[PDB]
Amino acid sequence: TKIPRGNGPYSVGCTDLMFDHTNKGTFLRLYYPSQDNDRLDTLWIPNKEYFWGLSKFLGTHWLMGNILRLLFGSMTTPANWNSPLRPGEKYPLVVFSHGLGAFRTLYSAIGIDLASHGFIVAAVEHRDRSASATYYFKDQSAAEIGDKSWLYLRTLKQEEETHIRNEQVRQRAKECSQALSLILDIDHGKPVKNALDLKFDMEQLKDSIDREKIAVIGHSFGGATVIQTLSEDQRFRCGIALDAWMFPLGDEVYSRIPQPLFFINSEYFQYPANIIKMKKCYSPDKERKMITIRGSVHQNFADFTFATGKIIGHMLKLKGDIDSNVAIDLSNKASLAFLQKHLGLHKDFDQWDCLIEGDDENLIPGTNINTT
Ligand SMILES: *P(=O)(OC(C)C)OC(C)C
């Protein structure tokens, strides 16, 4: 497959954690430094109902769903599935929020890269009906049987958009906060029964978190979720909004974010009415950075950018004029530098500090949308 391996020194493991089993419990995919590097065998889109969900999102049918499943049902992503957690160290932790029509597995290039640099990543699956699909269990016996209840994307009427997107960003923030609590709780001995029966022993996570080093990151709906989560939850020490979609946020949020905030935008997606919300977060007393990736489209941040060929990708807008690997290294490296600065890490990420300032042939400092 063409999802890139991570560039950092650690090998990368992957597993899923759902707790509690209910529609109100937490559901996340974890990426983490693994002890060993035995095979890059993780299944990318691990269930057929995601393809039905994804098709429902693209406004098509049962047939497109079956086509996607054929194209992608067996694609892997470069992480050792259920591999042991690399011991002897406390890792900084990232909570990741997916965009509208996505789900927890679709930003593995980001997650796997961060994990190869020593982060644990918890990519959350939202149950706000913004995911194409997701699932949960109606009772503990259903979880033992693997008897999943599915939840599919809600389509909205224009008259619903403002209220519902807002309610969803609030729930989303609460899901980020709650997923954080879950990991923090396991970090500190909380016994936990994974609703999914997986080989990875969640006890490995006991005493594995550097609890002061917590960031929230997210793409597009997930960008808005970064900002909301930051405003509510001070355990998150900084934010990185990947081509945020600002529309869901209420006016109240803007004055309420003390933590450092990084906007990494695609050249081809942004518009003034959206950029203007981003500019409202700026204040001499706060740290905000913004860079724009030259030749990039919105989809450059998610994994479908790696799923097809140049020509098809370009025509479907999964790819822009920049190389997908070039784009995702620029985003990841900038991110790593930002994390090192605002989490106080003692690594070598500050070598890409100039990428925070847009100092690359493939970056614009700030935004091409010059609206002030
Ligand atoms: P975001 O949540 O981006 C997805 C396409 C990944 O919102 C857009 C669709 C407006």
Rg measurement, Å = 19 Å
- Determine the N-to-C terminus distance: 43 Å
Assign the CATH class: Alpha Beta
Q: Give the helices and strands as they follow along the chain.
A: EEEHHEEEHEEHEHEHEEHEHHHE
Number of helices: 10
Strand order of the largest sheet: 5-1-2-7-6-10-11-12-13-14
Number of strands: 14
Assign the structural class, choosing from mainly alpha, mainly beta, alpha/beta, alpha+beta, or little secondary structure.
Answer: alpha/beta
Quaternary organization? monomer
Major sheet attributes: 10 strands, mixed
Ligands in the model, by name, code or SMILES, are:
diisopropyl phosphonate
The CATH homologous superfamily name equals Alpha/Beta hydrolase fold, catalytic domain
Indicate how many domains the architecture comprises: 1
Helix content: 25-40%
